[PDB]
């Protein structure tokens, strides 16, 4: 009824989403909103994923895919609990990143979704488009920062946004940083003030 | 001589845990450790327990994945113990994962690709189940269903066939003392013939 809102930020690498989360966190009542990032590096799967992303260890595509997904499931209760307590979660990447990136590497879009099926359903999923100055920002320091791979990931994101069962909001890359900041700031506080009812389930 | 990775498999109520403890008592507690899957001390381990005892539900795909990730959380632990000379007695492993996922309808090939890369066991002891064991599956936990167990056994056999890993089936016709002694022996024998590096399962 007056639960917190579950707001997710999605986007390619270098889309500036991490920066947009900081902004929102700073422009909202401290003791009523938390930040949550995936992969969540404070767990064992989280550290294995950190080892894979930082080149210091390899795993088959399938295994990383499930590690990322299990990583999220470890927090399915944490998320649901916070929301029921009135705490709003600003989530950096969620099941959508998982599906987009897995499918970009070759996995089935639909099989991937069933692995995220049941996770707390976001109320809003803000996608930060990245222009060609941001797309070519991927020098390649982490394992997923190539150029045609980022374009294949972009395609998967599009398929999902075009399904329509999830309330997405795309913020054009063409806004000025100060405008982007105010745009997001207003839609987010709006979601916090009006969010009601129980926490739904994703893709079920 | 590194540690031997010895895995125990079998249907529900087959006496796995019992035999695994029998080994833990008859062998020098120092060079041997017990590892139980699902390892219920982790966050995924507890979600698995809640699923098994019907406290929570998840799609089949999610349960398959939790079990799998649950083993991967310990993939490094395992490999580090083997090389430090410690032998691992493991209650259920990758084989349980594929056998139970497939009985539910998953592709065995796909299931195996998720276990692909874990430390390869040096010996897998399969505890065959008799009528008494089979009948002990009365629905207490979510998979203890006689007819479901039968299809899990089909998956187990399918894997036994592939001449990949080293399997040993222990007859359900042996009595407790001879059974305990037999396993104690193939296990002791296994610990002392281990050579080469730790392999990779279905790589
Ligand atoms: C959450 C998630 C992230 N990823 C990738 C996105 C990034 O390439 C990498 C790190 O994500 P993240 O921690 O958000 O860092 P960044 O600022 O680069 O986005 O993990 C997946 O492949 N699958 C997933 O499920
Ligand atoms: C390891 C594993 C176990 N299981 C099931 C086997 C059992 O039905 C259940 C509990 O196993 P376990 O904790 O070993 O107890 P027991 O073998 O006596 O039943 O977990 C899977 O379905 N997949 C797996 O990957
Ligand atoms: Mg059981």
From Swiss-Prot, chain A:
Its EC number is 2.7.4.9. GO terms for molecular function: ATP binding; dTMP kinase activity; nucleoside diphosphate kinase activity. It catalyses: dTMP + ATP = dTDP + ADP. Keywords: ATP-binding, Early protein, Kinase, Nucleotide biosynthesis, Nucleotide-binding, Transferase. The keyword ATP-binding applies. It holds the Pfam family Thymidylate_kin. Pathway: Pyrimidine metabolism; dTTP biosynthesis. The keyword Transferase applies. PANTHER family: THYMIDYLATE KINASE. Homodimer; the dimer arrangement is orthogonal and not antiparallel as in human enzyme. Belongs to the thymidylate kinase family. This is Thymidylate kinase. It comes from Vaccinia virus (strain Copenhagen). The gene is OPG178.
Swiss-Prot record, chain B:
This is Thymidylate kinase. Induction: Expressed in the early phase of the viral replicative cycle. Poxvirus TMP kinase is able to phosphorylate dTMP, dUMP and also dGMP from any purine and pyrimidine nucleoside triphosphate. The large substrate specificity is explained by the presence of a canal connecting the edge of the dimer interface to the TMP base binding pocket, canal not found in the human homolog. GO terms for molecular function: ATP binding; dTMP kinase activity; nucleoside diphosphate kinase activity. Its EC number is 2.7.4.9. PANTHER family: THYMIDYLATE KINASE. GO terms for biological process: dTDP biosynthetic process; dTTP biosynthetic process; dUDP biosynthetic process. Keywords: ATP-binding, Early protein, Kinase, Nucleotide biosynthesis, Nucleotide-binding, Transferase. Belongs to the thymidylate kinase family. Disulfide bonds: none annotated. Coiled coil: none annotated. It is an enzyme of class 2 (transferase). The keyword ATP-binding applies. Homodimer; the dimer arrangement is orthogonal and not antiparallel as in human enzyme. NCBIfam families: DTMP_kinase. The keyword Ligase does not apply. PROSITE patterns: THYMIDYLATE_KINASE (PS01331). Pfam families: Thymidylate_kin. It comes from the Viruses. It catalyses: dTMP + ATP = dTDP + ADP. The gene is OPG178. InterPro entries: P-loop_NTPase, Thymidylate_kin-like_dom, Thymidylate_kin_CS, Thymidylate_kinase. Pathway: Pyrimidine metabolism; dTTP biosynthesis.
């Amino acid at each position: 009824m007056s639960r917190g809102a579950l707001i997710v930020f999605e986007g390619l690498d270098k889309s500036g989403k991490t920066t947009q989360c900081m902004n929102i966190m700073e422009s909202i009542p401290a003791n009523t909103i938390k930040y949550l990032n995936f992969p969540q590096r404070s767990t064992v799967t989280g550290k294995m994923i950190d080892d894979y992303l930082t080149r210091k260890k390899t795993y088959n595509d399938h295994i990383v895919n499930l590690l990322f997904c299990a990583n999220r499931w470890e927090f399915a209760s944490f998320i649901q609990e916070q929301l029921e307590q009135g705490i709003t979660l600003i989530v950096d990447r969620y099941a959508f990143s998982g599906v987009a990136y897995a499918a970009a590497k070759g996995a089935s879009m639909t099989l991937s979704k069933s692995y995220e099926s049941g996770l707390p359903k976001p109320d809003l999923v803000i996608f930060l488009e990245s222009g060609s100055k941001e797309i070519n920002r991927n020098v390649g320091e982490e394992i997923y920062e190539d150029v045609t791979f980022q374009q294949k990931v972009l395609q998967e994101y599009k398929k999902m946004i075009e399904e329509g069962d999830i309330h997405w909001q795309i913020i054009s890359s063409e806004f000025e940083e100060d405008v982007k900041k105010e745009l997001i700031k207003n839609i987010v506080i709006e979601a916090i003030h009006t969010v009601t009812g129980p926490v739904g389930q994703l893709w079920m």
